[PDB]
Symmetry: C2
Subunit: 428 residues, 2 copies
């Protein structure tokens, strides 16, 4: 009888609750919401973050980060998505990915794993794109797992391991750093105009080692700019950063009179400005919890080197600003550090005059309840930069909620051109 061809703008409420938990230094999705082209989106999240109960009182605060991204479906499917919308009703169904059989094999995607073992691929593919563009180190290779079932238990359960806060050892110079550059002069002659050309080519190589390892960085150096559709990267909408604090509880019985237990409870807000959605896609929110990288057995570089030369100590501007980067070992910074090839990296020529490390007294070593890196970070450069959550197990009491937990309410309001429920159920 009466065929409907259009719809008014209606206020849709997409608010819901979230019960979240995770580990230290792993990225995990906490909320998502699919969107349609032409929508007007707004988000506001309010909740409280908690850590597991501590073995002692409060010593060090933790840092919490919240992120929101928008990913069009065209970035995930490509040409398949283009033909999908042009065909219309008789379009081919989109491809899928395979998941595991347990209930928690997709916890990093913020959803319960369906019993069928099959789910759409836009959440898994959007997670990889975010990680490879914003969170991993620029010099390490991308993650290219095809299906969620290809991950190990740790990655699927809690998320991918992220990088420590920047220090001398956790933010070294990239591995493709050269300390020498050779030329092909003659046996008894040299071209000096050719020498000038050699320095010019070395300058462009050093630019791409320190600043420009991505395509959008190269364009930015010329003074241009690239849209997020040019390099197929997710669009960041909002970032929030805050510190979590709490209070202490005192024991009052015979045995525990004089000891204390700390609990962390912090309220937060994550507000995203109004956004106009240009195409069909998804909007995802993620969280990250980290501690400042304090190590017990770390000392000053001048203390660790022992025998000091004029270059080390004088701080002469002519020598500091004209020498190639120096290669140092982990032994020079940590007790029992290594000397082999895997314990070697390169730093600035006088970096020790621009920072001072933190000191932990030997009375605090091997003491439960203090969030510390006991000893030194182990492994090669890749394992040294990435955070390992199992090293923080000595700070918390064993519980089923991991190392941190939160409860938040996401206030989502969208203006959508969709027919009402009454229109959908009445034939005439």
């Amino acid at each position: 009888s009466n065929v409907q061809t259009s719809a008014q703008r209606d206020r849709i409420d997409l608010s819901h609750l979230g019960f979240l938990s995770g580990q230290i230094g792993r990225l995990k999705t906490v909320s998502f919401s699919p969107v349609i082209a032409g929508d007007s989106f707004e988000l506001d999240a309010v909740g409280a973050l908690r850590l597991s109960p501590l073995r002692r009182g409060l010593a060090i605060d933790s840092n919490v980060d919240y992120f929101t991204f928008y990913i069009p479906y065209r970035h995930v499917y490509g040409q398949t998505w283009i033909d999908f919308m042009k065909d219309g009703v008789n379009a081919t169904p989109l491809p899928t990915v395979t998941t595991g059989i347990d209930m928690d094999q997709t916890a990093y995607l913020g959803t319960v794993n369906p019993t069928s073992g099959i789910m759409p691929k836009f959440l898994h593919q959007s997670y990889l794109n975010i990680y490879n563009n914003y969170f991993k180190a620029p010099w390490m290779p991308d993650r290219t797992e095809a299906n969620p079932s290809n991950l190990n238990d740790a990655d699927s359960r809690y998320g991918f391991r992220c990088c420590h806060l920047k220090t001398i050892w956790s933010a070294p110079l990239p591995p493709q750093t050269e300390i020498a550059r050779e030329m092909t002069t003659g046996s008894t002659t040299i071209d000096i105009m050719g020498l000038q050309s050699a320095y010019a080519k070395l300058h462009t190589d050093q630019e791409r080692d320190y600043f420009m390892q991505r395509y959008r960085d190269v364009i930015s150096s010329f003074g241009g700019k690239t849209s997020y559709d040019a390099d197929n990267r997710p669009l960041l909408l909002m970032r929030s950063n805050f510190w979590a604090s709490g209070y202490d509880v005192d024991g009052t019985d015979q045995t525990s009179l004089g000891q204390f237990s700390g609990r962390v409870q912090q309220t937060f807000k994550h507000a995203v400005p109004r956004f106009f959605v240009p195409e069909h896609g998804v909007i995802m929110t993620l969280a990250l919890v980290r501690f400042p990288p304090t190590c017990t057995e770390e000392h000053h570089y001048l203390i660790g080197k022992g025998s000091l030369t004029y270059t080390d100590l004088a701080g002469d501007p002519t020598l500091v600003g004209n020498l190639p980067p120096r290669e140092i070992a982990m032994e020079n910074l940590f007790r029992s550090g290594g000397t082999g090839t895997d314990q070697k990296f390169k730093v600035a020529e006088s970096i020790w005059y621009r920072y001072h490390p933190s000191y932990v007294d030997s009375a605090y070593h091997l003491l439960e309840g203090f969030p510390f890196l006991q000893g030194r970070p182990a492994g090669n450069m890749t394992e040294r930069v990435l955070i390992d959550h199992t090293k923080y197990d000595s700070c918390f009491q064993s519980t089923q909620l991991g190392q941190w937990n939160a409860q938040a309410k996401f206030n989502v309001s969208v203006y959508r051109s969709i027919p009402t429920v009454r229109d959908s159920i009445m034939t005439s």
Copy 2:
């Protein structure tokens, strides 16, 4: 000695002259200029357009169009361009295309053909992208010639054939237009809720036949928008439209006392607003000359049908707005028109009450000097919409400059971060 690492913004002059010629209704490149990321570009073209001398006086003015487009190199090379800029000095040279051996095998690209037979592919590939996105009919297939040498003599010498100005026969309904839609009702029963669903699916199919045959049109119907990098299309900067006029010259000798000769000479301006160049690429300018599509042996539809029914003549709003599109033949509009399958197309139900054709008296038939389509447009629908320049040969006197010629000065001013000539030649 002294190595330079930066440069000031300098005013570069890229002005040059152009001597242009072509045929009626063929797209041809008249100017181009490569650009660098971060540039500030501005263009202003001033010149005069001429036609070949006419066999008689001035009767009909012609229409001239000028276009300017910007095409990044990333649209032409894709991932190859991305790796080119990330590698730096030691990058692999870009691929090339093969050209012909004659001097005029690349005239449609606005350049003289080099004697080596090899040229970069960014001009040829940018020309195809412009034609497939803005000039061909939406329902005809794309042009995908790999090399300039794969074209025929006519296309390479003058350009691709474009479409006539919109009329009843030159702008028909797309060939994928249906006049019926079937359902699968029962032998003695019908579902009426299923009938409502059938109309909904028919509406979406008709939307994609009349309005949305490109991806960016589908997104626009939802109320969203797509950048030119999403569908990899050229960016239009400016369009100019004007008519060309002239005057007449009188003969004064014994034989030609009383006859006249018309010449067309029109000055024009094509100004492009200041543009910020975001990436490396090229900026191209093209021209198009067309005549209004007047045919000698064309008559009214009511005259050609002969026997008139109530639906044809009454103009009743209920019948006009509720009937499927009607299929008519070329015989109903042109003398000696066809009736076979290739001379059939579909129009609106009462299109003849919304326009009136032009009348040419029989005294003007087969008379040299008048720009007309003698008789009818021949061929199938594809050949009927595209303009054929050989039909206008009877209007001009034979000359080496084709059917139109022009002489213009392009004022190009760009702000570029490039070192001076003195910096480039002095070592210190």
